Design a protein around this ligand. Structure first.
Ligand code: TPP
Ligand code: TPP
Ligand code: CA
Ligand code: CA
Ligand code: CA
Ligand code: CA
Ligand code: CA
Ligand code: MG
Ligand code: MG
Lengths: 560, 562
C-alpha cells in the first residue's frame, strides 16, 4: 500500500481543527482515518484491531470535549493510534515504534494531549479520578474522561477506583469500550454480566452503538455536563472496517510490518509435564497467546485457568491450589508480576507453598518500551526468603530449569526473554538439575564471566578472544557459593552478566557472598543501567546497555 | 458484659468443645450457652496477653455455627485477615494455648498452616480468603474429593481489588464454594467506600442476623449442600457483648494486656499537618490506615485534602499519580508490608513518569507480635532498584521530619521509611527545612572501623562505636548514595560495616557494595541487616536481638570480623 488520499483528515491535525469541521463531515472523516490507520500500521507494524474499534469513539471525543484542557485518559493505550493521529502526530506515524520515533502508547513527555503514560492496563479510572479531584480543588472547570476496555475493567484496581469515585462524588466520565474481547476472548464473571454500576454509585447510560457517530456525539454532549460519577457503556467491534481482523480478532490484535520462541519452549514443557503428572495446573492472567498456553488449554481444558487481567488473583489462587497438593504454574511476564508482588510474598513465599512462576519477557522487550521492560524480577524476587530463582541460558536450559523449579517443593521462579534463542538442541527428557549448581562452559584464566541468563552466547564470543573462563550460572538465589569461592581464588577479575537491573540484581548476590566471606577479588557487574531504556528493536536496546559482545568485551578490557 | 475478667472463668461447656469434633456432639440447645462461655473466655485471655479484640467478639456466634455445620478440618474454612480468628483457635485444640498467644514461641497472631491443620491458609494481609478458598475448591473437584470450601470476608476486606478479581473468577469456573460476608459496617476506621454504601454469578442469601445461632446453623446447613458460587450476607456488631467495645469500636480493635517519646507515625502526622498548613497543594492518602499511619489530626483539619481509599493500596498510588499530573502534591502514607501490593503502580504509574509523589513508609523493619506477615523487611530492596526513586532512611524523630521535608520538596518520586513505635527521643527542630540530597552526616570520628548506618540502629551503633573507638556515619540516603563519603572511608578504614533494618539481600548495604565494586575499591565490607528467613513473632527487642541488630549483636559481628 501507499499513502491513501485523505483530504479531510489533513484538515484535522488537532482537536481544535477537527472541532471546526461540521457533523456532516465526521462520517467521511472516519473512513479516511480508518484508511490512514490501516496504511501506517502496515508500514511500521504495531497494535491494530482495537484501534480500529475506537475510530468513531475517538473522533467524537475530541469533537465534543475541549481537549487538551479537558483530560482524556486511555486505558492501556494500544488503541490510541487514532488519538495520536488526531493530536498533531498523523505525519509522524511513520516513525511509530522505531528508535527515536513515536512510542507504543500515550506518553506525557510526547504530547500535551497524553494525560497519562499507559501500557499496563486498568490505570485510567484511577488517574482520571485523581485529575478530577485536583481540578475540583483548584476551581478549574475541566472534564475528566477515562476510556477503559471490558478486558482492562477485570483488574481489581479498577473496582477500587470505581468504588472511590463514588465516595468522593467525582465529576468524571468513565467510558466502557465493550467489544467482548481481550487479546483472547474475555473470560470471567464480569464478561458474562456485560453480555446481558448504578449500585456502585454510578449514573449508567447505554449501551450505545460505538460506531454511530451521530449518536456518540449526542450522547457525549449530554453526558459532558452532567454531575458526579457518570458511566457510558459503549459497544464496539474489534477490527471494525477490516474484514480479516473482524474475522480473526486474536490474530489482528497486532501485526508486523509488511529457532523456537522461548515461550513456545515453555508451552511444550507445560504440555509434556501435564501428560506425565495429573497435578499440574496452568494459570495465566489473560495472556494465553503471549505466554503460549495454547496447546495446554486445548489438551487439558480442566487444568487451564485464565483469570482475566487479574495478576494478584492468579497468584493467590495458585497458593490455594498448592494447599490441596496440586502443582500450579503461574505464567506471567516480568513486568506484570510487579502487580502480584504482595501475593507472591505473603501468600506463597511466607507459606513456602509449592508454586512455579514461569516469568516470560524478562529483560528488554523492544518496541513496547519501558512500561513493559522485564528489568527488575531478579532484584525484587531474590530478596524474598524461600524463593528459588533461576536464569536459563538457552532453550534446553529453559526446559531443564522449568523442570527443576516445578519439582522443587517450594516457590520457584524461572525467567526468560521474548523472542528466540541460539537454537541449541533440546533434550526431550523431563529431568531436573542439581539446585544451586552452576556449569562451567569454558575453562580459561585471568578473568571469569559469571553469566545469569541468555547473554551466555555473547560472553562465549568475548571469551574466545580473551581466553576467559565462562560459567553458566543457573541459580541466583541458591547461589553456587562453592564455585564462586574457587573462581575468586583462581582469577583476577570476576564479571557478572545479567539482563536485569544492576542494582539489587544477580551480580549483587555474588557481591554479597564475596563480602561476607572476606574474598577480595575485583568484581565488575554488567547488566541494565539505572534508567528507563527508550523503545527500539531489542538488539539496539541491548547494544545501548552494553549487553552485546562488543559492549561486554569493551567493559572487561577497560577493567583489566 | 462490662469488665474483663481477671480470673479464668467457669466454662464447662467450652471445656467440652476443645475441637470441632466434640463441638459437633453437643446439641443445638447448648450452642447459645457455649457462645456466652466462649465470649467470656475470649475476654479473659485477650486481657491476659493483649491482642485483637473487637473483631473476634463479633464472630463468636459465626465461628460456633461454622464448625458445627461444616466437617472441619476436612471441609476448608478460610478466615480473611485472621485477626477475628481467636474464637476459631479456641475451638480448634488451642484454647489452653491461648495464654501463649502473640508471645515468643507461642501461638501466632493469625491463622497459620504450620500451627494447626485447622488453619487452611496463613493470612494477615487482607482479601486473600476468596482466592485461597476458590483455589482449594478447584483442586478438590479435580481430585474427586467431596469437600466444602468457605471463605469468611469482612466488609472492609471486600474493598480490595483482588477480592473482586476472585469473585469474578469463581463465578466463571462455577466453583462449589461458600463466601460469607461478615458485615459490621466497619474497617479499622469506619468503612469509607462506594461498596460500603451498598449478578456477578453468585447466589446471594440475606442479610441474616450474625448473632442468632439458630438462623446461622439453619442457613449454613442449607447452603452447605447447595452447588455453585454461594454468597451469605451476615450482619454482625464489632464488639458484640462487650459494652465498652461496642461503644468504641476503634479503640477496642486491639488492646494491651491488663513514658517515652512520640511515635514515629505521630511525628509523621505532625509533619503532615505542619506542611499542609503552609502548602495548599498537599494531599494526604491512606488505604484505610488513618489511625495506624496517624492521619487523625490531618483528616480533621484538612478534610477536603484527606483521602481514605479503603483497603485499596493499588488505587491509592495511581490516584496520587493523577493528582500530581494536575500540579497537586500527594503524600501516600503506606506500611512497607502493604506497599508490596502497589509495587506495579509505584513503578509504572509513578516512577516511569517521574511524577511528584511522596511515600511515607511506616512499619519499616520488624513489627513485633504481628509477626512475619506484616514485617517491613524488603522496601529498601524493592525500591532502590527502581530508576528515579529517592530512598531515605531517618535515624531519629528530627531526621524523620527533615527527610519528609526533603522528599516532599524534591520534584519526583521520594520514599521515607521508618519503624513502628518510638525513637531515642531527641529534640525535633520545629522548622520545616530540608537537607542536601545524597549526603550523609558524620556523627563520630574514630578509626579502623566505620559504621555506615541507614536508619534507626544509629543509636545502637553509636554505643558500639564509642566502645570500639569507631567512625559512625548517619547515611540518610540509600539511593542517591553518598558516594564520595563511602570512598573516603574506604581508603581511611580497614572495615566498613553497613547497618539497616531491611533484608541484607538487595539492601542498602549492597548499594554500598555495588559502589565499591564498580570503582574497584577493595575494602572489607560487613553487611548487617535482616536475615534470609521469616523472623518468628516476639517482642520487637527480641526480634532485633535475634537478627544481631542491637548494640551487642553489632559489636559481636564487627569484633568477630576484625
Ligand atoms: C496489567 C496488564 N496485564 C496484562 C496486559 C496485556 N494486555 C495488553 S492489551 C490487553 C487486553 C485488552 O483488552 P481490552 O481492555 O478490552 O482492550 P481492547 O483491545 O478489547 O479494546 C492485555 C491483557 C496489560 N497491558 N496490562
Ligand atoms: C492489604 C491490607 N491492607 C491493610 C490491612 C490493615 N488491616 C488489618 S485489619 C483491617 C480491617 C479489616 O476490616 P474487616 O475486613 O472488615 O474485618 P472487621 O475488623 O470489621 O471484622 C485492616 C484495614 C491489611 N490487613 N491488609
Ligand atoms: Ca498478530
Ligand atoms: Ca537425556
Ligand atoms: Ca582451553
Ligand atoms: Ca548467597
Ligand atoms: Ca551508587
Ligand atoms: Mg475488549
Ligand atoms: Mg468489617
Amino acid at each position: 500500500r501507499e499513502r491513501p488520499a485523505t483530504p479531510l483528515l489533513d484538515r484535522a491535525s488537532s482537536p481544535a481543527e477537527l472541532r471546526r469541521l461540521g457533523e456532516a463531515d465526521l462520517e467521511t472523516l472516519a473512513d479516511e482515518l480508518r484508511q490512514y490507520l490501516l496504511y501506517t500500521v502496515g508500514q511500521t507494524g504495531g497494535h491494530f484491531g482495537a484501534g480500529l474499534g475506537v475510530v468513531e469513539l475517538t473522533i467524537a471525543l475530541h469533537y465534543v470535549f475541549d481537549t487538551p484542557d479537558d483530560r482524556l485518559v486511555w486505558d492501556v493505550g494500544h488503541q490510541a493510534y487514532p488519538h495520536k493521529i488526531l493530536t498533531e502526530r498523523r505525519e509522524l506515524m511513520g516513525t511509530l515504534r522505531q528508535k527515536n520515533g513515536l512510542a507504543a502508547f500515550p506518553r506525557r513527555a510526547e504530547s500535551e494531549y497524553d494525560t497519562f503514560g499507559v501500557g499496563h492496563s486498568s490505570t485510567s479510572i484511577s488517574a482520571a479520578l485523581g485529575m478530577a479531584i485536583a481540578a475540583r480543588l483548584q476551581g478549574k472547570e475541566r472534564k475528566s474522561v477515562a476510556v477503559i476496555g471490558d478486558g482492562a475493567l477485570t483488574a481489581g484496581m479498577a473496582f477500587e477506583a470505581l468504588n472511590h469515585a463514588s465516595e468522593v462524588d467525582a465529576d468524571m466520565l468513565v467510558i466502557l469500550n465493550d467489544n467482548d474481547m481481550s487479546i483472547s476472548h474475555n473470560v470471567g464473571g464480569l464478561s458474562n454480566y456485560l453480555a446481558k454500576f448504578e449500585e456502585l454509585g454510578w449514573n449508567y447510560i447505554g449501551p450505545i452503538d460505538g460506531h454511530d457517530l451521530p449518536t456518540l456525539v449526542a450522547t457525549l454532549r449530554n453526558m459532558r455536563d452532567m454531575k458526579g460519577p457518570q458511566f457510558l457503556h459503549v459497544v464496539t467491534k474489534k477490527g471494525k472496517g477490516f474484514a480479516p481482523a473482524e474475522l480473526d480478532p486474536i490474530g489482528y490484535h497486532a501485526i508486523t510490518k509488511l529457532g523456537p520462541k522461548y515461550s513456545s519452549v515453555f508451552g511444550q514443557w507445560l504440555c509434556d509435564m501435564a501428560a506425565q503428572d495429573a497435578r499440574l495446573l496452568g494459570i495465566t492472567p489473560a495472556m494465553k497467546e503471549g505466554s503460549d498456553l495454547v496447546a495446554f488449554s486445548e489438551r487439558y481444558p480442566e487444568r487451564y485457568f485464565d483469570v482475566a487481567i487479574a495478576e494478584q488473583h492468579a497468584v493467590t489462587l495458585a497458593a490455594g491450589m498448592a494447599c490441596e497438593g496440586m502443582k500450579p504454574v503461574v505464567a506471567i511476564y516480568s513486568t506484570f508480576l510487579q502487580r502480584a508482588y504482595d501475593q507472591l510474598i505473603h501468600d506463597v513465599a511466607v507459606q513456602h507453598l509449592d508454586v512455579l512462576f514461569a516469568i516470560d519477557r524478562a529483560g528488554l522487550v523492544g518496541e513496547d518500551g519501558p512500561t513493559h521492560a522485564g528489568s527488575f524480577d531478579i532484584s525484587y524476587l531474590r530478596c524474598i526468603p524461600g524463593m528459588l530463582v533461576m536464569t536459563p541460558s538457552d532453550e534446553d536450559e529453559l526446559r531443564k530449569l522449568l523442570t527443576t523449579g516445578y519439582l522443587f517443593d517450594g516457590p520457584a521462579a524461572v525467567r526468560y526473554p521474548r523472542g528466540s534463542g541460539p537454537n541449541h538442541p533440546i533434550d526431550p527428557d523431563l529431568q531436573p538439575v542439581e539446585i544451586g549448581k552452576g556449569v562451567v562452559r569454558r575453562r580459561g584464566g585471568r578473568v571469569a564471566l559469571l553469566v545469569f541468563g541468555v547473554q551466555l552466547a555473547e560472553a562465549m564470543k568475548v571469551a574466545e578472544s580473551l581466553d576467559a573462563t565462562v560459567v553458566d550460572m543457573r541459580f541466583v538465589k541458591p547461589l553456587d557459593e562453592a564455585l564462586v569461592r574457587e573462581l575468586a581464588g583462581s582469577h583476577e577479575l570476576l564479571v557478572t552478566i545479567e539482563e536485569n537491573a544492576v542494582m539489587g540484581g544477580a551480580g549483587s548476590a555474588v557481591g554479597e557472598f564475596l563480602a561476607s566471606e572476606g574474598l577480595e577479588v575485583p568484581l565488575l557487574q554488567l547488566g541494565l543501567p539505572d534508567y528507563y531504556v527508550e523503545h527500539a528493536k531489542p538488539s539496539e536496546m541491548l547494544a545501548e546497555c552494553g549487553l552485546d559482545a562488543a559492549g561486554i568485551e569493551k567493559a572487561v578490557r577497560q577493567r583489566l
